Amino acid sequence: SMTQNPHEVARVRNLNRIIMGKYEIEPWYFSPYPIELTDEDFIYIDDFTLQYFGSKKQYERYRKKCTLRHPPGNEIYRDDYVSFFEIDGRKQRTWCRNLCLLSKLFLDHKTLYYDVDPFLFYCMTRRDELGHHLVGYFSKEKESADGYNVACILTLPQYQRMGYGKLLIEFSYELSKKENKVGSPQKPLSDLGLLSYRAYWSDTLITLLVEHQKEITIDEISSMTSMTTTDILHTAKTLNILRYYKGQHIIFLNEDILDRYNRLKAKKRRTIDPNRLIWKPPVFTASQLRFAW
């Protein structure tokens, strides 16, 4: 509706403390939630619809009537650990807006100037007796001309330090591998996301270089991992892989690098299984690549 108070005081205030589902989280950055809610002790976030509440009684009446128990979209991936839901921003406007309002509380460079229409939201969840619980997500432009396979990526604070951030990145490149396109995350990464990406870049690189045996090319590395040639050479510089010895360029896999390779093979970290990815790239027409009217 067009019913908004022109004399309503507009003051920037972060939320005191949110209660998403069973966890009590403290927001780090400002998110444009309703001005009335920014001056409340507790805000309730439904962990299924991501709807915000300032009144506990309303959150009770909402919970007793809400029948949604999983992200409103098609399940494109599911193993015995986590599941992935593909959600269109133009189809699920209400849900995607609530996700962006929630995500802005913890993303400093995320912006809500425009609507969620031009974005595809891939949400990673954990199935439970109650249903699928959102633990993290990464947004993706519908048809990125800049080759950005990840716009904004976030793992919820109550599910941090559990390897979920590495799964979002790995699943993001897995979608790019299915699209037969190279990709790179959107340029202004946060401190937390930058470290997680440097970890994924170095680990998947050393695993590939060791097992390849045959002579490799920079363009071929980009074909197998869907990483951009810039990210590959930057990862090759972070490590001491690339050396120019006696008038020619070679790859050096020294023992210190091979020690991290041996640790990775014995480690039992969660990985994405491509065989459980039942997903064909969405096809948009010229009319569909516009804001809804």
């Binding site: 460079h109 995320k110 100037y113 974005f119 432009e141 800049d146 716009a151 959107q186």
Partner: peptide
């Protein structure tokens, strides 16, 4: 723009 700023 691009979801970042």
């Amino acid at each position: 723009s691009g979801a970042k700023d």
